[PDB]
Amino acid sequence: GSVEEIRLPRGGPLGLSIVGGSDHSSHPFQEPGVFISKVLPRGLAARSGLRVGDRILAVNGQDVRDATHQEAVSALLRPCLELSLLVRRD
Amino acid sequence: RTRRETQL
Ligand code: NA
């Protein structure tokens, strides 16, 4: 498998899509956790190395393994210069 | 469950 920390520079859009949470279904993948369902090709996420499939373990150091969808969204939009995402791949 | 995708 693999684990990677991705640093995304940042207000405007991330160019990713998430599914999952402790409260919703990961319809594309009953796997628990928040998952990147989609990556805008040539978007911020895409370029920065993010990949469809990646499970989001943590946003700017906040454990979101067990996060709800809304909590993961909240954390992904908190204002910041550097958005740091720890993900698992494969 | 309910699927739910958020584009960001
Ligand atoms: Na805070």
Can you tell me the distance from the alpha carbon of A67 to that of A59, in angstroms, rounded to the nearest whole number? Answer: 11
**Nearest partner of A71 among A13, A14, A6, A20, judged by Cα:** A20
Residue A6's φ and ψ, nearest 5 degrees, are: -110, 130
Kindly report the three-state secondary structure assignment for every residue of chain A: CEEEEEEEECCCCCCEEEEECCCCECCCCCCCCEEEEEECCCCHHHHHCCCCCCEEEEECCEECCCCCHHHHHHHHHCCCCEEEEEEEEC
CA A89 to chain centre: 11
CATH code of A32's domain = 2.30.42.10
Task: Output the six-digit token pair for A38.
Answer: 């989609």
Q: What is the resolution of this structure in A?
A: 2.5
Which method, experimentally, gave rise to this model? X-ray
Query: Residues of A at the B interface (Cβ-Cβ below 8 Å)?
Result: 13-19, 21, 24-27, 30, 37-38, 69, 73, 76-77
A28: domain range? 1-90
Torsion A68-A70-A73-A77 (CA) sign:
negative
Q: Which residues between 1 and 8 in chain B have a beta carbon less than 8 angstroms from any beta carbon of chain A?
A: 1-8
Virtual CA dihedral for A65, A68, A73, A79, nearest 10 degrees? -70
Longest dimension (CA), chain A: 34
| A21-46: b (≥16 Cβ within 10 Å) or e | beebebeeeeeebbbbbbbbeeebbb
The domain tally of chain A equals: 1
- Which residues does a chain break follow in chain A (C to N more than 2.5 Å)? 10, 29
